[PDB]
């Protein structure tokens, strides 16, 4: 089993009130079966697009999930991932500064 | 049934040529094999076709294969009596042991033997142990003569059967009749239409 | 590459245990069981890739497979049914696509073994009229009063089996066509040259291998047990 | 610039009955084909994914794969039956096939197979073979797969002849997309201190990002990984550990082919 690595980042420079696209990048995991959710304030975002699943030269799987979002001062965004390697689903929160 | 054979059954005279069709929908189609099976016996491999457009031969047997049309023919040149058999088409879906063989229902071939010198007669044969018990043998008749079954429950008449004496190149049709109940042998084959020149010894 | 099967012919009852065995000394990893029925091609029942392994085929229901060794592959029928009346072919092969087939096993599963009866075999000596007319001598064998029809007729001359000049009825005829469980009759001919039959050194024998009850099947009737047996009739040549 | 053509197949086998196979195709870092288990046909993800093959040539080629997917599924299931109880579900098979292109008309083809995330089997020359590190039980599947002469000749033609020809055609048809130039956009941020220089939306992949105070390049600059965007562009961030107070004077200079000399300088 391979534990998944989650990276959350924005497509364009983040401005409050300005619409943007949020990306969630999940890598280095095995087996391929995975459940990825993109959350707004802990709630599931309705329309989350998925890239086709692929794997790198080291045979580790990777997949990109993305959704349209409008960053605000209050709203918190996150990427939740459930995998067989982990007992509990790892949640990585979006930090604009990070 | 992904493998279909035509015709179902076939009746041909000795010396004549015949073609046997096989059509399949097996995917993929690695190889096609033709089996010969005598009434009772096992499966004898005649040929195996492997190429996209393949042609093979085995003495009097020859076969073609078209993988684009998914279709194969089996030609038998100059049919002999021993060709009387069921012919089975088989398609394998792999080039290895991972394959499954797909069998056709078969094509039943009957070859009528050519009787050159007919000498029709009814002979009386006696039991080796009990002299009183006897059978009667209608033999050496041409294939154009049919042997009708008995019109009596106590009388028993067998269907025509051809034997082959290989060392003499001689073939003869024969039929056996008997009954336990003043049973005559000139009255044994009354129901069957027999030649006028049939020999009856007394 | 040769494959063998035992038994070659079996007559069984409904509910009885039937074991169809298959031997192969070719060191083939893979073995296969098929059954042949009129109107159908050969259908896969069970197969094996190695010892201690058995796999379901296309029609596995009612059958259990056993492979104790590389050489043996066994098809077991725990509760035999009349629907399992068929000819069973065993096969073997290595990594290649070729499957080498066995001679086949005839099986008949009857509802009751009450009507099973061995045949009475009679041999009929050639007519003196035939010898003087054709210079050939025909011997006629006759097996009568047997049930079921599972018999094998063979001609033997001087202890060796002859096939040339021999033809046997393709099917046995019913002795009483009106009856459902009617007994059968079978005839066969052996034709030789007159001079061969006239030879007193030649020993002619018609052999009928009858298939019936096993030496373990239960028999309740007063008559002799109709076990699998050979009944033969025999005659010597004469001038 | 050398382009690597990759056909990545992933097959999952949960038990004796359940199975799925999904495929993706890459030319460099751009996806050209998608083939989902639910889909009966291979899908183009680029307008030029057919390459220079005629319609008749593609249908025949797709049909070959269509039969293969069904065949591969059954074969793996039968190969498990040969081992059991040596090998057991769940089982993951990965295939990495294709060819790498070189100047002129030179190329090298490959077909690499992984079992449970470990590279074990390759097609080399005229046959299948195990690589160093592979468990010995695989010698039986290898011997079985090598017995199939038809598969061997087909794979040989696909690798030796078909792959190079198809990619030579893809590079002609996809020249406009492969040689595209997307301009990066940069922004700065700080975390408890560590300063982050975000760079997003650039193509192709090669990029130069460094923290600088004037003309002096900072040695403590740490580049992250190349992260993809949804619109087929790249994202990269550079981090620098600094003491609190001396943030002023630091700048992030970004060099990329799309900019054309005019580097993005971003002061704080
Ligand atoms: C416990 C488990 C452990 C696992 C161990 C790991 C090992 C696994 C690795 C093995 C994987 C290979 C799977 C093998 C399957 C075989 O059983 C079947 C068994 O099915 C075969 O069908 C063929 C007819 O279609 C027949 O060939 C036929 O058999 C005939 C004999 O009767 C002839 O020999 C015929 O040959 C004639 O025809 C040939 C055609 O080219 C040649 O021209 C030849 O010269 C000629 O004589 C042959 O075709 C064969 O007999 C028959 O057997 N073979 C096939 O289906 C054909 C082989 C295709 C292999 C495909 C490679 C897959 C690559 C992964 C990528 C998939 C993604 C798909 C999307 C791609 C789309 C993008 C498009 C880009 C295209 C570029 C391509 C480059 C990429 C590689
Ligand atoms: C396809 O090309 C290969 C060459 O090797 C290629 O493999 C493919 C799968 C790709 O990975 C590609 O990058 C790589 O270059 C040919 O394989 C060669 O075949 C030779 C003859 O078939 C073989 O020679 C052996 O066999 C002969 C038998 O007469 C014997 O005399 C020799 O001593 C020798 O053992 C050679 O070994 C083999 N090459 C390799 C590297 O194994 C293949 O023939 C081509 N196929 C087709 C259909 O064009
Ligand atoms: C074979 O595996 C599949 C996939 O793992 C099984 O399907 C799962 O069944 C469980 C319990 O019923 C469900 O909670 C899952 O949602 C199913 N998963 C999927 C992907 O559909 C299936 O039960 C197994 N089949 C057999 C016969 O063992
Ligand atoms: C992946 O695709 C295969 C093949 O299309 C599916 O397996 C087939 O399942 C369907 C319905 O379950 C059957 O009609 C087919 O007969 C099966 N095999 C074949 C060759 O037809 C499989 O269900 C798919 N898996 C998932 C998760 O969608």
């Amino acid at each position: 089993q391979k534990t998944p690595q989650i990276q959350v980042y924005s497509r364009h420079p983040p401005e409050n009130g300005k619409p943007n696209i949020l990306n969630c990048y999940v890598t280095q995991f095995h087996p391929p079966h995975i459940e990825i959710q993109m959350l707004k304030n802990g709630k599931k975002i309705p329309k989350v697009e998925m890239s086709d699943m692929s794997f790198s030269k080291d045979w580790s799987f990777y997949i990109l999930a993305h959704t349209e979002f409008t960053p605000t001062e209050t709203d918190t965004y996150a990427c939740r991932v459930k995998h067989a390697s982990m007992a509990e689903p790892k949640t990585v929160y979006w930090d604009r500064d990070m | 049934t992904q493998v279909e054979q035509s015709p179902q059954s076939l009746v041909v005279r000795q010396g004549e040529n015949c073609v046997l069709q096989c059509n399949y929908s097996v995917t993929p189609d690695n190889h096609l094999r033709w089996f010969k099976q005598d009434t009772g016996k096992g499966l004898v491999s005649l040929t195996v076709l492997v190429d996209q457009k393949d042609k093979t031969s085995n003495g009097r047997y020859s076969a073609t294969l078209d993988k684009d049309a998914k279709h194969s023919t089996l030609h038998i040149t100059a049919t002999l009596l021993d060709d009387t058999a069921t012919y089975i088409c088989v398609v394998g879906d792999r080039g290895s042991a991972l394959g499954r063989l797909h069998f056709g229902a078969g094509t039943q071939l009957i070859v009528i033997p050519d009787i050159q010198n007919p000498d029709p007669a009814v002979y009386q044969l006696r039991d080796s142990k009990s002299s009183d018990k006897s059978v009667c043998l209608f033999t050496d008749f041409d294939s154009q003569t049919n042997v009708s079954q008995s019109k009596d429950s106590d009388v028993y008449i067998t269907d025509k059967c051809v034997l082959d004496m290989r060392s003499m190149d001689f073939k003869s049709n024969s039929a056996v009749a008997w009954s336990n109940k003043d049973f005559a042998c000139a009255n044994a084959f009354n129901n069957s239409i027999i030649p006028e020149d049939t020999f009856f010894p007394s | 590459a040769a494959v063998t099967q035992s038994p070659r012919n079996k007559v069984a009852v409904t509910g009885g245990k039937v074991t169809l065995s298959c031997n192969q000394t070719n060191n083939h990893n893979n073995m296969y069981w098929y059954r042949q029925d009129t109107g159908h091609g050969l259908r896969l029942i069970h197969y094996s890739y190695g010892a201690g392994s058995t796999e379901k085929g296309d029609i596995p229901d009612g059958y259990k497979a056993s492979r104790p060794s590389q050489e043996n592959f066994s098809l077991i029928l725990e509760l035999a049914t009349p629907s399992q009346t068929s000819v069973y072919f065993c096969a073997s092969g290595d990594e290649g696509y070729t499957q080498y087939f066995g001679p086949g096993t005839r099986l008949l599963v009857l509802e009751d073994l009450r009507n099973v009866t061995p045949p009475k075999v009679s041999l009929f000596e050639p007519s003196k009229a035939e010898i003087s007319h054709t210079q050939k001598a025909t011997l006629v064998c006759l097996a009568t009063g047997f049930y079921p029809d599972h018999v094998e007729l063979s001609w033997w001359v001087n202890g060796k089996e002859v096939h040339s000049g021999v033809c046997t009825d393709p099917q046995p005829l019913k002795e009483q066509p009106a009856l459902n469980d009617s007994r059968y009759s079978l005839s066969s001919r052996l034709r030789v040259s007159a001079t061969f039959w006239q030879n007193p050194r030649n020993h002619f024998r018609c052999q009928v291998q009858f298939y019936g009850l096993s030496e373990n099947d239960e028999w309740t009737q007063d008559r002799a047990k109709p076990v699998t047996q050979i009944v033969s009739a025999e005659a010597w040549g004469r001038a | 610039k050398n382009y690597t053509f990759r056909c990545l197949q992933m097959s999952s086998f949960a038990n004796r009955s359940w199975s799925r196979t999904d495929s993706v195709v890459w030319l460099g870092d751009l996806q050209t084909h998608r083939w989902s288990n639910d889909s009966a046909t291979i899908s183009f993800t680029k307008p030029w994914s057919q390459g220079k093959l005629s319609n008749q040539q593609w249908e025949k080629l797709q049909h070959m794969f269509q039969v293969y997917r069904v065949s591969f599924t059954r074969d793996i299931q039968e190969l498990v039956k040969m081992m059991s109880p040596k090998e057991d579900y769940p089982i993951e098979i990965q295939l990495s096939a294709g060819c790498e292109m070189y100047p002129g008309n030179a190329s090298e083809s490959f077909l690499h197979v992984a079992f449970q995330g470990k590279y074990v089997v390759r097609f080399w020359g005229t046959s299948w073979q195990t690589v160093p590190g592979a468990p010995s039980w695989l010698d039986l599947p290898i011997k079985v797969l090598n017995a199939d002469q038809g598969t061997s000749a087909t794979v040989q033609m696909l690798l030796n002849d078909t792959c190079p020809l198809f990619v030579r055609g893809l590079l002609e048809a996809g020249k406009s997309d492969l040689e595209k130039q997307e301009k990066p956009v940069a922004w700065l941020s700080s975390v408890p201190r560590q300063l982050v220089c975000h760079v997003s939306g650039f193509y192709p992949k090669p990029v130069w990002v460094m923290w600088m105070r004037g003309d002096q390049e900072q040695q403590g600059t740490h580049r992250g990984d190349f992260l993809p965007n949804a619109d087929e562009t790249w994202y990269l961030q550079a981090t620098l550990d600094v003491e609190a107070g001396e943030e002023a004077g630091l700048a992030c200079r970004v060099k990329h082919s799309s900019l054309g000399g005019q580097d993005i300088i971003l002061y704080w």
Side-chain angles (χ1 to χ4, degrees), chain A residues 33, chain D residues 13-15 17-20:
Chain A
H33 184 263
Chain D
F13 296 85
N15 37 55
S17 56
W18 195 93
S19 168
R20 76 168 298 148

Side-chain angles (χ1 to χ4, degrees), chain D residues 11-15 17-117 119-166:
Chain D
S11 298
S12 300
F13 296 85
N15 37 55
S17 56
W18 195 93
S19 168
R20 76 168 298 148
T21 294
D22 301 291
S23 306
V24 286
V25 182
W26 298 90
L27 181 63
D29 57 358
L30 304 171
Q31 194 181 344
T32 55
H33 306 85
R34 156 178 58 247
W35 196 20
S36 182
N37 190 71
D38 316 305
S39 185
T41 49
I42 310 162
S43 300
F44 301 142
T45 58
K46 296 286 175 295
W48 44 265
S49 297
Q50 201 174 323
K52 291 286 181 178
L53 300 175
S54 64
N55 289 336
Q56 192 167 300
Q57 283 166 30
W58 173 248
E59 296 288 80
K60 186 182 177 174
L61 191 63
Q62 183 182 240
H63 184 262
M64 189 220 74
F65 285 109
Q66 284 175 330
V67 178
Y68 156 79
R69 194 175 73 174
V70 179
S71 295
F72 176 82
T73 307
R74 200 189 79 176
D75 290 327
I76 294 298
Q77 285 173 324
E78 294 305 309
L79 288 170
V80 180
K81 290 174 180 179
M82 285 197 191
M83 308 305 138
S84 64
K86 173 74 187 179
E87 283 305 306
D88 197 29
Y89 301 102
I91 286 161
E92 299 294 333
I93 315 281
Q94 281 165 289
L95 277 82
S96 183
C99 51
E100 195 177 333
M101 310 307 292
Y102 301 98
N105 288 122
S107 66
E108 190 186 336
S109 296
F110 56 88
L111 203 166
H112 287 212
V113 182
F115 185 76
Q116 310 281 59
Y119 173 50
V120 287
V121 172
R122 71 162 181 178
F123 195 90
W124 190 251
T126 57
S127 58
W128 302 92
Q129 58 163 226
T130 53
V131 295
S136 303
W137 66 265
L138 280 160
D139 289 5
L140 187 50
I142 290 305
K143 193 203 269 195
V144 171
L145 292 159
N146 285 331
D148 199 334
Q149 288 171 38
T151 299
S152 180
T154 305
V155 171
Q156 281 179 63
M157 199 196 73
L158 286 167
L159 295 170
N160 294 10
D161 304 305
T162 314
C163 192
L165 183 75
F166 179 62

